[PDB]
Amino acid sequence: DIAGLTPCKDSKQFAKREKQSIKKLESSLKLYAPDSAPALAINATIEKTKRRFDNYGKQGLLCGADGLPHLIVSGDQRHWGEFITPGILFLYIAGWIGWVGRSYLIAIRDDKKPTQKEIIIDVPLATRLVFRGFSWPIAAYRELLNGELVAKDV
Amino acid sequence: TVAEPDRPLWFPGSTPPPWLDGSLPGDFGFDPLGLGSDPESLRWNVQAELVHSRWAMLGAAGIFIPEFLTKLGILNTPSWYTAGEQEYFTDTTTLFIVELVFIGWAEGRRWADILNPGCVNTDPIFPNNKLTGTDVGYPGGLWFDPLGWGSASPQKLKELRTKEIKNGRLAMLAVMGAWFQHIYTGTGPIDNLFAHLADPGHATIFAA
Amino acid sequence: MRDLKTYLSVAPVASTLWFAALAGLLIEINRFFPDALTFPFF
């Protein structure tokens, strides 16, 4: 497929890895009575392994000759779940955090002792401000247009 | 609104904290950790203790009365501990979401009252209805005080509110009592009562 | 009481509470949605 890779659903090496992992955990499982709690734990790890490989196979991940997923970050629309979509989620959260922290710093900057609220958090003010991050992209875009985002002549 | 300096305290001989002067109903001078030390938190906690008291009284009824009747040949009601697992006319989750919506409305308006007293007394549809209470936590009005027993003189309202808070404290202790009993013992609370009445010297905490 | 809430608002304590909540959250998310190299919902 892309970059000479093959889908992990079609990869012999991928299935060989799932097989060798499961047989490894079963080799550990042969040591304990099947009713015992170590046994149930190793069974849970086995079920979680099958869930892992089956999900990677389902969601269309490409594999290398190593039998391991490789991520396509070029922007190819078949693989936005591998970077572009979690990336937009990240930028939303990071923009949220930074926008909220900036809101707090602006809110306390004209206090009589600003540093006082930087080492002892004004939690009521913080709670008032945390949900501004929900609309941070509109707020920051509007500030960029209005000229409130950047300090003048710095 | 009446200071009570010589009131009977929880710890006879002790000095009550300065933020408990006897004005509050149910004031026995008990706040050793200073949880109501500042006026704001004491206000809040007065509302809290009130709501906990009322919920715990309704709960004490719902545990003890049906368990007591079903223990007799009167009702078939199941154990209060396991009543959540039961299957009613619909799934409990959707019942719970119903509950969160309606209870969310009531608690939301009570909330607006604590934060802004009086601002919430008018019906948002039929304004002529309104509510009579002037004290937070005692809303009055036809809905919450139809018999008018709530709008009266001081010292009478102090007597009755003291009764309410003491009953509610007892009910809190009782609800948690049936809880830890049903976890510790294997029966309902009335079986603990009877088993204890049969042999109180032995059938206790220490029968297990 | 007021002083104690103040102490609990101080930088290290607010940080432990905040990151402890964040850790419980991320742990539970990886408990119900383990592994996951991708955003599968598209």
Place this chain on the structure above:
Amino acid sequence: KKGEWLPGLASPGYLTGSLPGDNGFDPLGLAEDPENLKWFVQAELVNGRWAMLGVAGMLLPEVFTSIGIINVPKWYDAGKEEYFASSSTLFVIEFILFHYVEIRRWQDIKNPGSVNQDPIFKQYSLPAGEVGYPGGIFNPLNFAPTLEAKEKEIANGRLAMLAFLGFIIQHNVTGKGPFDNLLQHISDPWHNTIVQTL
């Protein structure tokens, strides 16, 4: 008393009460700056109007089809249907036209009264109105654009924006049409709910 979305809560100072639909609701302070408030007034107007039309065209053809009076594809299935033009052509038409109109409206937002006249026919101009309420040919029946009229426009716009949100999310989870959802619910409501839908 201009109406309170949260009864106890006070209004933001920047919400005067002169705007229609002012219930004191801006908890994230998006409209604290007045230029933001203007821009968002126009934005709420256009999102609300498009949402009214869209909710109508999504719900009514369905209920008509299900009654049997007509046969119209589902609003989500309407896109796949065959039409007298390639959908690409349809798109280029739509884009060119909207590119003209929207930029004229925008010229009015920035410099009110500047685009009021026909640039082809120098007569047949528009009367001087308010930003977001063009008179003249846009109001042939010449209704009175007063409060309660604008307040009803904004109310139905907000209910229709919420409605549209409900349509897309509903159709995502249920795989059916909105009126199909309403029928399914009215059937057995206590057992047909988003609770059971998930």
